[PDB]
């Protein structure tokens, strides 16, 4: 570290070197901080967490009990020990509270004033953070497994919604049109994720073992359908070209958006070229998931080497994205982990689980 400081100070190395290297070192040293706690408010398992993209100060959390909690992640107290207090909460007494499990919650990108949340009550509610009141509701004919707003699109403000229907619903928060559907999957869509690189590229993963990339502008079906073998087992596309040998219940684009991570109930995680959907054949070993719903996992940002923090049973398994090497397994939960979210400002991780806890993992030293 003193070598790094000296090399930054004298200009041998770009300051970029020290940032990325020290962030990587912090991530490798990621450990359950009993020096930080998250206030327990959910009566049920936390299905989803979302740190706001701008300023990374506030975090949303949706539980199976239907409540939403809005936490402050900044140590506003002068002590080195603090609890991430719950700022707001859509509780059992809020008139608009979800009737059933909140499966996904997402801050509006570009501003912290709005956030959207979907539930097994077949609703995607848009909330005004300041008033804490719903500003819009999108009813769907079938329960929502996942929704996602594009983190990049300054132009369109569509929400891709995956429900048990075989169709992917696109809901325009700009004047409200929830009619658009992308057809081509054959079973429930368990995950949707917009590319962080291209405004209109959407990757949708479903129960039929397929992941499809769509250009929602385009009127002609999916761009690419991810294939495990890239052509070794080639068939007229009616049943082949599966991304996994089971249900694909998780999606995540890498930070730069040039690759796609999909995790499926075949206990595999695969990395795909997001442009031509080619399997990069990164191994990753065996990534244990048996989730019957969407599995929310994240990648690191702004480190020398990219990581992926994937829920592995009751632990969080940390892998290197481009080599597969399992860095470590963060072990602090008591039931299966549903979601982990990465605070890229400080290389911190927050993981929620069915044990009704949100555990913060902070780098040690």
Partner 1 sequence: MSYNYVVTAQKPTAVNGCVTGHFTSAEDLNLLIAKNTRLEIYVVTAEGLRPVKEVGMYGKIAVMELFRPKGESKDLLFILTAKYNACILEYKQSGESIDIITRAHGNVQDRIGRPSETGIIGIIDPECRMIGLRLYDGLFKVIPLDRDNKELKAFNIRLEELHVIDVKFLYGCQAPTICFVYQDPQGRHVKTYEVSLREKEFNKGPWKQENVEAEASMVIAVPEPFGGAIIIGQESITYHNGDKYLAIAPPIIKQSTIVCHNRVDPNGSRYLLGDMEGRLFMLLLEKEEVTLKDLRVELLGETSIAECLTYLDNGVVFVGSRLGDSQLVKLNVDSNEQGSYVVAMETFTNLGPIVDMCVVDLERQGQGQLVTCSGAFKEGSLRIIRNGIGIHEHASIDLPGIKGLWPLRSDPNRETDDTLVLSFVGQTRVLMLNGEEVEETELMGFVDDQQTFFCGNVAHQQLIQITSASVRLVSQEPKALVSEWKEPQAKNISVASCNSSQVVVAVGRALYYLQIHPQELRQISHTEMEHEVACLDITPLGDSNGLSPLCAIGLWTDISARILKLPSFELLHKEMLGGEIIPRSILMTTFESSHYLLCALGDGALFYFGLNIETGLLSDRKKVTLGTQPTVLRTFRSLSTTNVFACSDRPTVIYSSNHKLVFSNVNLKEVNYMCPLNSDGYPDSLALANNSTLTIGTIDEIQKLHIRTVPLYESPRKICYQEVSQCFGVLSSRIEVQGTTALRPSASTQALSSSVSSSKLFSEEVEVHNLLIIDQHTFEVLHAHQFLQNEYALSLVSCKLGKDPNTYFIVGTAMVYPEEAEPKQGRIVVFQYSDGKLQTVAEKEVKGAVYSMVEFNGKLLASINSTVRLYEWTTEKELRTECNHYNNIMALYLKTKGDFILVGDLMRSVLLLAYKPMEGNFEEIARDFNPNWMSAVEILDDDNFLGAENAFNLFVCQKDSDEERQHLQEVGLFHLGEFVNVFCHGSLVMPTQGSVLFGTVNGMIGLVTSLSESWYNLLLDMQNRLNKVIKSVGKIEHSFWRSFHTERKTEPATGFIDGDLIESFLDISRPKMQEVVANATADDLIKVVEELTRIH
Partner 2 sequence: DAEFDEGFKVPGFLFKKLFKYQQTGVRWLWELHCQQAGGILGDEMGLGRTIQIIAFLAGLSYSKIRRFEGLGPTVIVCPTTVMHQWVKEFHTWWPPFRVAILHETGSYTHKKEKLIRDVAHCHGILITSYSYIRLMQDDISRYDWHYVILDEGHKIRNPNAAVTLACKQFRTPHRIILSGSPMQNNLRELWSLFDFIFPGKLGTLPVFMEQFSVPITMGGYSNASPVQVKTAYKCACVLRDTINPYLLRRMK
Span interacting with partner 1, options 44-52, 54-62, 175-183, 288-296, rule CB under 8 A:
54-62
Binding positions for partner 1, 100-159, rule CB under 8 A? 152
Pick 80 or 154: Cβ nearer partner 2:
154
**Partner in contact with 25, chosen from partner 1, partner 2, none, beta carbon below 5 to 8 Å by kind:** partner 1
Span interacting with partner 1, options 13-21, 161-169, 170-178, 227-235, rule CB under 8 A:
13-21
Binding track, positions 238-277, relative to partner 1; x by CB under 8 A: -----------------xxxx--------------x-x--
Distance of alpha carbon 77 from the chain centroid: 29
**Partner in contact with 180, chosen from partner 1, partner 2, none, beta carbon below 5 to 8 Å by kind:** partner 2
Grouping H, G, I as helix, E, B as strand and the rest as coil, residue 9 is: helix
Pick 182 or 299: Cβ nearer partner 1:
299
Span interacting with partner 1, options 4-12, 140-148, 162-170, 262-270, rule CB under 8 A:
4-12
Retrieve residue 37's tokens: 């706690």
CA dihedral 76, 131, 356, 123 (to 10 degrees): -150
183-206 CB burial, b ≥16 within 10 A, e <16: ebbeebbbbbbbbbbbbbbbbbbb
Q: Which residue among 10, 79, 154, 179 contacts partner 2 (CB under 8 A)? A: 179
All residues at 6 or more sequence positions from 220 whose CB lies less than 8 Å from its CB, including other chains: none
Minimum CB separation of residue 47 from partner 1 in Å reads 27
* Packing angle of the helix pair 15-28, 2-10 (nearest 10 deg): 160
Under the binding rule (CB under 8 A), the answer on residue 122 touching partner 2 is no
Under the binding rule (CB under 8 A), the answer on residue 154 touching partner 2 is no
Q: Report d(CA 245, CA 228) in Å as an integer.
A: 9
Pick 239 or 323: Cβ nearer partner 1:
323
All residues at 6 or more sequence positions from 242 whose CB lies less than 8 Å from its CB, including other chains: 208, 209, 210, 227, 228
Q: Which residue among 70, 126, 173, 182 contacts partner 2 (CB under 8 A)? A: 182
Grouping H, G, I as helix, E, B as strand and the rest as coil, residue 19 is: helix
Grouping H, G, I as helix, E, B as strand and the rest as coil, residue 343 is: strand
Q: Which residue among 217, 231, 232, 235 contacts partner 2 (CB under 8 A)? A: 217
Distances (CA, A) of 365 to 84, 225, 254, 348: 20, 44, 27, 13
Euclidean distance between the first and the last CA atom of the chain, given in angstroms as a whole number:
12
Number of residues that bind partner 1 (CB under 8 A): 47
Under the binding rule (CB under 8 A), the answer on residue 281 touching partner 1 is no
Phi, psi (deg, nearest 5) at residue 247: -80, 140
Under the binding rule (CB under 8 A), the answer on residue 183 touching partner 2 is yes
**Partner in contact with 281, chosen from partner 1, partner 2, none, beta carbon below 5 to 8 Å by kind:** none
Binding positions for partner 1, 189-248, rule CB under 8 A? 196-197
Grouping H, G, I as helix, E, B as strand and the rest as coil, residue 20 is: helix
Q: Which residue among 33, 83, 112, 345 contacts partner 1 (CB under 8 A)? A: 345
Phi, psi (deg, nearest 5) at residue 360: -95, 135
Binding positions for partner 1, 14-33, rule CB under 8 A? 14-20, 22, 25
Q: Report d(CA 21, CA 157) in Å as an integer.
A: 35
DSSP letter (8 states) at residue 233: S
Q: Which residue among 155, 234, 290, 346 contacts partner 1 (CB under 8 A)? A: 346
Distance of alpha carbon 142 from the chain centroid: 22
**Binding site residues, partner 1, CB under 8 A:** 1-3, 5-6, 8-12, 14-20, 22, 25, 55-57, 74-80, 152, 196-197, 255-258, 273, 275, 302, 304, 306, 322-323, 344-346, 365
């Amino acid at each position: 570290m003193l070598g790094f400081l000296s090399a930054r100070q004298t200009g041998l190395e770009d300051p970029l070197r020290l940032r990325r290297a020290e962030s990587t070192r912090r991530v490798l040293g990621l450990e359950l901080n009993k020096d930080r706690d998250v206030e327990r408010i959910h009566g049920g398992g936390i299905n989803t967490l979302d740190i706001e993209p701008v300023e990374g100060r506030y975090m949303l959390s949706g539980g199976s009990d239907g409540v939403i909690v809005l936490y402050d992640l900044e140590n506003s107290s002068r002590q080195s020990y603090y609890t991430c207090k719950a700022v707001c909460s859509i509780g059992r007494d809020h008139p608009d509270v979800h009737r059933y499990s909140v499966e996904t919650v997402q801050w509006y990108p570009h501003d912290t004033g709005m956030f959207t949340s979907s539930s097994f009550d077949k609703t995607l509610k848009v909330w005004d953070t300041n008033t804490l009141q719903t500003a819009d509701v999108f009813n769907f004919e079938e329960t929502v497994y996942s929704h996602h707003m594009s983190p990049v699109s300054t132009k369109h403000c569509l929400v891709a919604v995956g429900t048990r229907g075989p169709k992917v619903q696109l809901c325009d928060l700009k004047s409200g049109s929830c009619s658009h559907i992308l057809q081509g999957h054959r079973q429930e869509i368990l995950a949707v994720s917009w590319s962080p690189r291209y405004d209109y590229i959407l990757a949708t993963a479903s129960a039929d073992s397929r992941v499809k990339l769509w250009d929602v502008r385009r009127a002609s079906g999916c761009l690419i359908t991810l294939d495990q073998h890239n052509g070794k087992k080639s068939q007229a596309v009616e049943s082949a070209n599966t991304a996994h040998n089971g249900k694909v219940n998780g999606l995540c684009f890498t930070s730069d958006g040039l690759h796609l991570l999909t995790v499926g109930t075949d206990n595999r995680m695969r990395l795909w070229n997001s442009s031509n959907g080619e399997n990069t054949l990164v191994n990753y070993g065996k990534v244990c998931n048996n989730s019957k719903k969407g599995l929310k996992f994240t990648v690191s940002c702004g480190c020398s080497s990219e990581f992926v923090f994937v829920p592995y049973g009751s632990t969080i398994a940390v892998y290197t994205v481009y080599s597969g090497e399992q860095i470590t397994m963060l072990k602090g939960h008591y039931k299966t982990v549903d979601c982990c979210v990465f605070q890229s400002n400080f290389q911190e991780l927050y993981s929620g689980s069915r044990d009704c806890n949100i555990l913060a993992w902070v780098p040690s030293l």
